[PDB]
Design an enzyme around this catalytic site. Structure first.
Site, mmCIF file in Angstrom:
data_model
loop_
_atom_site.group_PDB
_atom_site.id
_atom_site.type_symbol
_atom_site.label_atom_id
_atom_site.label_comp_id
_atom_site.label_asym_id
_atom_site.label_seq_id
_atom_site.Cartn_x
_atom_site.Cartn_y
_atom_site.Cartn_z
ATOM 1 N N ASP A 69 -59.647 -3.150 17.099
ATOM 2 C CA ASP A 69 -61.081 -2.494 17.184
ATOM 3 C C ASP A 69 -61.825 -3.361 18.194
ATOM 4 O OD1 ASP A 69 -63.292 -0.869 17.106
ATOM 5 O OD2 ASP A 69 -63.934 -1.762 14.834
ATOM 6 N N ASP A 112 -63.772 1.260 23.610
ATOM 7 C CA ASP A 112 -63.749 1.149 22.063
ATOM 8 C C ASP A 112 -62.218 1.639 21.670
ATOM 9 O OD1 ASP A 112 -63.840 0.818 19.436
ATOM 10 O OD2 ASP A 112 -65.652 2.398 19.169
HETATM 11 C C1 LIG Z 1 -66.164 5.096 10.767
HETATM 12 N N1 LIG Z 1 -65.736 4.359 12.076
HETATM 13 C C2 LIG Z 1 -65.802 5.018 13.241
HETATM 14 O O1 LIG Z 1 -66.697 5.830 13.318
HETATM 15 C C3 LIG Z 1 -65.249 4.507 14.504
HETATM 16 C C4 LIG Z 1 -66.050 4.675 15.792
HETATM 17 C C5 LIG Z 1 -67.115 3.465 15.760
HETATM 18 N N2 LIG Z 1 -66.722 2.100 15.060
HETATM 19 C C6 LIG Z 1 -65.698 1.260 15.612
HETATM 20 N N3 LIG Z 1 -65.131 1.283 16.725
HETATM 21 N N4 LIG Z 1 -65.585 0.025 14.670
HETATM 22 C C7 LIG Z 1 -66.340 0.495 13.696
HETATM 23 C C8 LIG Z 1 -66.720 -0.301 12.585
HETATM 24 C C9 LIG Z 1 -67.608 0.377 11.607
HETATM 25 CL CL1 LIG Z 1 -67.919 -0.535 10.062
HETATM 26 C C10 LIG Z 1 -68.251 1.507 11.823
HETATM 27 C C11 LIG Z 1 -68.334 2.162 13.262
HETATM 28 C C12 LIG Z 1 -66.940 1.773 13.852
HETATM 29 C C13 LIG Z 1 -64.851 3.683 11.874
HETATM 30 C C14 LIG Z 1 -64.432 3.166 10.181
HETATM 31 C C15 LIG Z 1 -63.351 2.097 10.090
HETATM 32 C C16 LIG Z 1 -62.301 2.150 11.186
HETATM 33 C C17 LIG Z 1 -62.459 2.761 12.603
HETATM 34 C C18 LIG Z 1 -63.256 3.770 12.349
#
Ligand SMILES: CN(C(=O)CCCn1c(N)nc2cc(Cl)ccc21)C1CCCCC1
Length: 377
Positions: free
Chosen positions: A34, A220
């Site tokens: 990530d 990302d």
């Molecule tokens: C809810 N999520 C997203 O909306 C991904 C998009 C933005 N994002 C990224 N890249 N890492 C993340 C980590 C968190 Cl805790 C929240 C949003 C994230 C993530 C959940 C965990 C795994 C990746 C998607």
């Protein structure tokens, strides 16, 4: 870097993960890669969706930091207990380091039911680390403690299952063709970059470029979609809806609210336009462009378990937090996160899925004036 090639696995839409070991003796886990976050966080309790979880009791090298972390976000949260332990990447460099690990003990809509990953590896900078920038991210630990050069690179290959390569500490020439082109990392928090021009099918959107980066543009691997600021997404689809006249579709389709389907195989790629993002170059008044196909932004949904045709989600969508160049962008390219030189490189991927008439490309140099201006303060 052959031992690292093809070290990423995944399923469509569920992200890319790499095999990691944590603790002594080593406990294997699959860890989502990530570039949009900065915490190394792993499931540590038997949540029903988890194939496996970090068992701190089994690790003789485990140290408690005696401090919790709480990470809320839009549709959910994860929370856990900070500590450090020994961490390695079996199909990565041959080294072991002591890193911070958040042991996740409670979460809401974080883990994916049916997925084969058990934690997340945030490769971005300490500035967005939780609870604060004193929690050293894993990759900073790795570089500080070994001789691994301060960069990593991703080839995301996209396909129900996906593969790719994370090359840690270098660049593998066999993963790309033509030249790398670099865009400056504007600030070390997210992997923030500046888009200076946008074209759909060779046609400039003619928006103030500041709009493109309102209020961020980031790279990302954790996001499936190309995500765009409201005001730019309106303009993008207006010109996308218009480049694609031979056929019409529900309005909701464009809002990612309904799916779109054609008879199997019968998808008209060609009525859909190529999209070109010109990024800020290394030199004053110089830029370059990356070009993606519909085969990148119309992504095939395996899961319509009430359908018999070819349905795809329009993989572009809007944001309140700025542009996000997710897996839709990254899958056409080899992406080089050159942290030592504060820049990101893009080259055409040796794996991207190409068709008869139109191909993903990375071209330069172009002359673009007032590129600073495109950034938001
Ligand atoms: C809810 N999520 C997203 O909306 C991904 C998009 C933005 N994002 C990224 N890249 N890492 C993340 C980590 C968190 Cl805790 C929240 C949003 C994230 C993530 C959940 C965990 C795994 C990746 C998607």
């Amino acid at each position: 870097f052959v031992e690292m090639v093809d070290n990423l696995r995944g399923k469509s839409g569920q992200g890319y993960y790499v095999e990691m070991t944590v603790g002594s003796p080593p406990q294997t886990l699959n860890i989502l890669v990530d570039t949009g976050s900065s915490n190394f966080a792993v499931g540590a309790a038997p949540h029903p969706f988890l194939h496996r979880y970090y068992q701190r009791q089994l690790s003789s090298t485990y140290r408690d930091l005696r401090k919790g972390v709480y990470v809320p976000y839009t549709q959910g949260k994860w929370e856990g207990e900070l500590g450090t332990d020994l961490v390695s990447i079996p199909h990565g460099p041959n080294v072991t380091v002591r890193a911070n690990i958040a042991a996740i003990t409670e979460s809401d809509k974080f883990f994916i039911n049916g997925s084969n990953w058990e934690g997340i590896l945030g490769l971005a900078y300490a500035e967005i680390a939780r609870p604060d920038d004193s929690l050293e991210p894993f990759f900073d630990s790795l570089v500080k403690q070994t001789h691994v050069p301060n960069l990593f690179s991703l080839q995301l290959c996209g396909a129900a299952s996906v593969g790719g390569s994370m090359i840690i500490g270098g660049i593998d020439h066999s993963l790309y063709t033509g030249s790398l082109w670099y865009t400056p990392i504007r600030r070390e928090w997210y992997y923030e970059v500046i888009i200076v021009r946008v074209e759909i099918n060779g046609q400039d959107l003619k928006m103030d470029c500041k709009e493109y980066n309102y209020d961020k543009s980031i790279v990302d691997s954790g996001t499936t979609n190309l995500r765009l600021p409201k005001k730019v997404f309106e303009a993008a689809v207006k010109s996308i809806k218009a480049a694609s006249s031979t056929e019409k579709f529900p309005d909701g389709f464009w809002l990612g609210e309904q799916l779109v389907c054609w008879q199997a195989g019968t998808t008209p790629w060609n009525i859909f336009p190529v999209i070109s993002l010109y990024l800020m170059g290394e030199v004053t008044n110089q830029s370059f462009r990356i070009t993606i196909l519909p085969q990148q932004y119309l992504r095939p949904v395996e899961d319509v378990a009430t359908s018999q045709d070819d349905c795809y989600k329009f993989a572009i969508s809007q944001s309140s937090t700025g542009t996000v160049m997710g897996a839709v962008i990254m899958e056409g390219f080899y992406v080089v996160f050159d942290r030592a030189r504060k820049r990101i490189g893009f080259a055409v991927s040796a794996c991207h899925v190409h068709d008869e008439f139109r191909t993903a490309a990375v071209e330069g140099p172009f002359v673009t004036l007032d590129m600073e201006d495109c950034g938001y303060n």
